[PDB]
């Protein structure tokens, strides 16, 4: 919480970029900390077709390390820096912990059952295929078909790196902000 | 403390007196470094204060390393995008130490600047803190009224019949139930009035001896309707025990008890001791109109709110009654034909005179008694006139705020409609871009990414 | 004077008329030196006025050599760190001469700027001086209420028992004493009511002839309790003589006198002349409830405050009573069976009719008398209705402000807690530095010097 | 919406979670152009 401490010191934001983020961050939450209730208000504005509160709840937990209850600006930026301008390795662990709802690191097709459901839920019911009750399960089933060899963290890292198509999608937003 | 920081040379000069009576240990002076005023441009209006002025409170935004986020370097000034006429009171805090509340500024924006700059409402000066809380109370009450959760069938019939019971103005069955309950209460009390009055010989027999064979049927039908509607209310109350503990259920129980109590009493033996008491209690179904009429609820609320004032009314009334009854009894006792036999006998005269009612059955017949009777009348006027305005004032305030609150709910529904309209417009704007601004281009790309991560497309 | 200084050439031109009728002594003109506007930057907002404008009042901060302390040389401007929207009214004074009070500005900050710049509240213009004093009075009352010294055993038991007597809601003995005193007063007045009412033969004998052998014991026990509690109050009053002169002690003396007076009277001979008077005076123990109930104290305060209004009430009441009694007596005199024998006899009818009481035993029976009786009733309504609202308004205001005052005391205790918390935090901050800001470094050095001048060390 | 516009990098960072469970179609980022404060002088009193 200095401005120079979170400078280009394992934080991928410059001094001017840090100033812009804090002006926007404190604009919505003047107290300097944003909580889960407010964390869903901004996210739901970007996706008005459905409700993003279900996905924001899992997103907030990933941002809120140590389950403090409120996510501060110091560790809010380092989450943005890892996700936006971070390296390959840091992005995958952050996403792995986003799917890993519980404490220990494992994915068992029930923990991320809600994750894919939240992605489909936040589109509302207005799409061309009119969706389906079992369409989130099909997306999970095909997702496990490419990494789940037998029944982990090491598997997730090697599977994403094996397919270059997901590789070029992770680095989508580093060039523009 | 750090607030009085310009007086450090004064304190250091005071420490010189310790040296003659001291044992010099070479206390190692800190040997500090060595003051130009800085600019605080809050959206156009530049504010200039010395840096030492801000640093004397190193736990807020202005005095901290936090303001380095708002430093705009090429102009060598701190640029904040906040209110220019509210940051004026922020700077005054760093000089004196007490915040001042602007009587002309909205309190929802004043609190926004206090939270932004790190100040707290606990440090505002005592000069304006009473009004700050008063204006904070009105804003707080506005939030509570607007967030009362008045929204009104995924589960069993209990909720969808309780919503009709609680709100009889909706649907079509709720209104019918409301009307039939009101009609039954009215006909019950009217019929009671009829059998109390004589209708017709051996004697002027009332309507309760030759008649009242069908009046009993009407009374038992009304009691049965009351009991069954109470049971239906019980079958839809999530707070069944608490709902029973509520005042409305207590009134319903009091209304329905007398018929069953009388039936039990007449099942075994029969006496007239509790007959008149039960007949008196039978009229308590009049208070069941509280649900039907909002006026009764408002009256109950205003009586419960100023309960202390009614207690003082009763205490002062009893005090004056006792004093004046004693005076009149001891002043109008030796008369030839006097009805002031005792202080309790003078209680009736005292309460008649105090309320400016007047009957003439008991009148003073002595020069001493008439003066104290007039003084009793004036003192009764004075005593009763004190708590009357406060009851009426509270009643009017409650009725106006419960007349208000209705428009508060109306603006909430319109506000949600505007939010939904914006959501529909934002969704429609994306489709128009798909068929064929600065931020809108990037925002639609996020939706485009969401489309192609689930291989689905938004359509109209 | 110096206020009209731009009109000096006008005055010098007027002096030309003296020269034809003068005897030129060579009056030695002063031959002065010879005007650019100066900048008054009060914390960012620069204010520009001519130097001659400020110099016309050479007894304040702006027009003096005192403002040379606030001259900041390299910018060639005077920099003050004061309120920018209150210094606006300071400059307007130097033009016209009358200060203007901002209705939207806190008076505790307005007075701060007036004291800072040398102005005084005696020079504010008559246009806004009535409201300035009114807002000053409210601020003054806030200070007085907040500084009432409500703090509550280094000396004898007198103070530690008077604190229980004055405040019966604290401790456990004070509450017991309060409850027992209230119970004794209530039982005394109730027992008096009982012996006044008949209980039972030769005659309808009341409860004071066959009974009242134990009633005398109860009365003397209550009087003894009152006397001993009065003595205990006397044994703990630092203002013993002044406390006796107080209204509460007078009421206590009036309550306790009748028993001893009656005992003295019955010790030697016995007559009934003062028996009824003493029995009437016995009930004056009712007013002892003033200590118990705050409502009685508030009522007494509001009657004492508007004592002039009660005097006008009494004067107008007597005026109307006399006029209407005379009119009714001379208008209803020649009736067959008339009770209007005289104006004093018509006083009863007039006071009954004016208060809208009505008895019907003494009524007019003439066309002339009925019209004046109706006019008497209307005039009584008008006369009584004038001072009733002011009594109720003052009572409500006093009750609300004593309901307020309580929260004023509550915020004072919280404010002292914050001050003590800051003192504890400042002391703790020094220890943390000792175990391991800008001003904090020098401040801790002063404490370090204080440690080593007495070879002692602060510890947790 | 456009009201919360300074949180666009936050929303873009949130979209990273979709990539592991997606099928990357090359969503064609807009490739925007790239912020000095402007003056709004309403009759003498400049607003920035």
Author numbering:
A (entry chain H): 36 to 186, 191 to 216
B (entry chain B), C (entry chain D): 2 to 35, 40 to 157, 163 to 210, 215 to 450, 472 to 495
D (entry chain A): 2 to 35, 40 to 53
How do the authors describe this structure?
Modulation of voltage-gated potassium (Kv) channels by auxiliary subunits is central to the physiological function of channels in the brain and heart. Here we report cryo-electron microscopy structures of the Kv4.2–DPP6S–KChIP1 dodecamer complex, the Kv4.2–KChIP1 and Kv4.2–DPP6S octamer complexes, and Kv4.2 alone. Thus, our data suggest that two distinct modes of modulation contribute in an additive manner to evoke A-type currents from the native Kv4 macromolecular complex.
KChIP1 captures both the N and the C terminus of Kv4.2. In consequence, KChIP1 would prevent N-type inactivation and stabilize the S6 conformation to modulate gating of the S6 helices within the tetramer. The present structure of the full-length Kv4.2–KChIP1 complex reveals that the C terminus of Kv4.2 tightly interacts with both KChIP1 and the N terminus of Kv4.2. The C-terminal cytoplasmic S6 helix continuously extends from the transmembrane S6 helix and terminates at S450, which is localized at the bottom of the complex. In addition, the cytoplasmic S6 helix (around S450) is captured by KChIP1 directly and indirectly, through the hydrophobic interactions between Kv4.2 (Y444), Kv4.2 (H479-L482-F493) and KChIP1 (H84) and the electrostatic interactions of Kv4.2 (Y444–K448) with Kv4.2 (H483–E486), respectively. In the Kv4.2–KChIP1 complex, KChIP1s bind and sequester the both N-terminal inactivation ball and the C terminus (amino acids 472–495) of Kv4.2, which would therefore result in preventing N-type inactivation. Moreover, while S6 gating helices adopt a more flexible conformation with weaker interaction with T1–S1 linkers in the structure of Kv4.2 alone, KChIP1 stabilizes these structures and enhances their interactions in the structure of Kv4.2–KChIP1.
